Symmetry: D3
Subunit: 161 residues, 6 copies
């Protein structure tokens, strides 16, 4: 019995990393449709504007047919309801991640009871990768090429040099 | 674009709890087909024989149309391959759970690279519930009715009284 | 042998949540007198002024006879000494909470050796509730009524709308 | 407004350590009456019989006027109800401890809703001390005198030599 | 100012894994001399006898000039004192590991104050690898070749087939 | 076979605490040479300027012959390469520390593959000590003398009074 599963994968993606890419690629294999959903996150003062983050995520998800990249600024749950998504995908890289995802998953069960939160663990290759430490390394001209897709490295380097 | 997602939900289920039931019910809503897969687990010396555990899981999953209950004794990954499952569902109740699931998910990526492990957090109602503590409470005639489906409570009480 | 136990329950309470209320209600049942102690916390830039937070905590603790609400800006330990409190009550919602409470409890043992720190775990109903995520949800008009006492919801909604 | 607070401090205490002693001493200062409650724990196969563990705990709690030592084999919650205790005291030495205490506290809220579970963190002097590692060190004639009260060291050494 | 640093790396090594090998290789690069120290561990009922575990560790550490493999059954601290070691090397694969190592490091500071405990994190390649799960996978004929040195895989397979 | 081990111990040290001092003293006993390396950390807005932090660390490490104090603002890995250090020493006070050190150690393995990261656990005396909580206590005139070397206490008190 075939089904349409529509999933959202929301985050700040500032910038999208090899870790994010691994997760959305796996979500893409599992669900009928995936929205890679980029939170405006204004109060976080992101390095990249929302438009830049949308452009970068489009470049790296281009080969995934059933993935669409969209910017949003409302609650992730309202965004899911707006797009008729029934699954919310989140990454769990470690124990510190777990606390917050548990709180958030419970909040979201209250806000949208039929939205199911599901968690994916990145491959051990990428699991230690953190947008913030990569940005800190790049600020000092350290080599970050192992952690970011090629077009993302190029934009991070331009944004700094 | 509709898809057939076939998931396995493996565990010892000795006995199946309200926590397990919440997870398989959610898996059932998300995937085309779910096998609730009961590990023989001989070296764990379960309270209930495999047959008893299969019978109890059938009683409590009866209303879920797309769920099938099966006993197995091989590796969970080989079991998934045998049944053409592409998703392995596991519960994460807390931080202690996370360590082991991370190790197991990585092992399973090696054994069956196209099998995707996905994690679900039980509702806060059930998250503290642990088959072992419930069994310990039942051994002393404590009331365990909040933690187990009714037929499971009845069989636990008979197995002890 | 009857005793006077005087406890302080200190925090930022910005705003007081159903979690805080559950803890102070339990502290109230256990100890002769409880001061719900609201830290000025200026460097945290709270959403609500100290006066507003005191007023809200008075509204929701009104039915607890042996609870008094007081604003303070000194060290919690000096505040306890000033009010002759022998017990300092803190909540532990999760593992992340534990680290900080351990550090703080040890600091406080040095500052006031006869002040005893004791920890309470909120009911599973409220344990995921975090003032910061509730405030984030409210900023977007999400429904926060399950997480806050009614007068607190009303003041949060006015403070934002 | 003076109150009678009756607390139970239950555990296996095999044997009672400097950590246990620090906790019961603090409980003794806070509550009207403390029962140091020693679980038979038969299925744990303790090093010391219940009688030996009761005798050792009596020797080290002798100076605490309001502490009574009692052996029990029922549920800790039924034991508390039997003795009219309204507080259940448990130690939290670290994060691993937290998981289990959370599960247990929630179970006990179901079994005895008016019994309040409260947690104490041992002094940094004793917090790493674990009955099992001390027993392992003693088996090889390592010096364990820093970790156990003097009469407990003496009985551990006799039980082994 | 050149120094002789003598380190011990103690464990059950049942059997030695790619994780153990990565750690001893790194210890070998850092210290003048490393004893890979294999605990008899009788009460753990190891899969491999002490002699077999010593032989396997010799095969895989053969290329490391400054490493010596020795079986022991006393306390690791007394073993270090016996061999004039001033450094005790332990692996930390995750958070669960941390609790126990902290307890053990503190115990060892008491038993041998001049012995320094130092911790190494395995490469992300090997960090999820656990002797017990590998043994469980091998029992069912799963492929374990990514996790063990070649001679260890060969002996594990003979020990089971 | 004697060796030159050159270690770096990098941090913000704002200000150097009894915990830092315990670690550098232990590093000093183990390695031929230790650079106590003080990160400019401009974006952290430290309480003490880099020069003040260098001066304070020189005062408290004066008795350690093989320790040198240096300020730096590049990546810790490039700093190590610049000074020919082969060991990077970091403290692990608790579980929360572990997450970040794991990420950082993995980043540093990429940036400088022959630099070995090694971890030390402070003595239980100092393990709860956190520069930030000490600074918070000092701001209110709480007694911080147990947590800081005497010259550091004196400079913290002048910097505030």
């Amino acid at each position: 019995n075939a089904m349409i599963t529509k999933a959202i994968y929301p985050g700040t993606f500032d910038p999208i990393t090899n870790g994010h890419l691994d997760l959305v690629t796996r979500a893409s294999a599992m669900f009928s449709h995936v929205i890679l959903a980029i939170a405006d996150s204004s109060s976080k003062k992101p390095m990249f504007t929302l438009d830049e983050r949308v452009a970068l995520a489009k470049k790296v998800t281009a080969p995934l047919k059933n993935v669409e990249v969209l910017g949003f600024s409302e609650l992730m749950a309202e965004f899911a309801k707006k797009h008729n998504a029934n699954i919310l995908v989140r990454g769990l890289r470690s124990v510190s991640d777990f606390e917050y995802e548990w709180q958030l998953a419970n909040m979201n069960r209250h806000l949208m009871p039929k939205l199911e939160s599901v968690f994916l663990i990145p491959s051990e290759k990428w699991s230690f990768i953190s947008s913030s430490l990569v940005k800190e390394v790049a600020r000092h001209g350290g080599d970050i090429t192992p952690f970011l897709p090629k077009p993302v490295t190029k934009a991070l380097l331009a944004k700094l040099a």
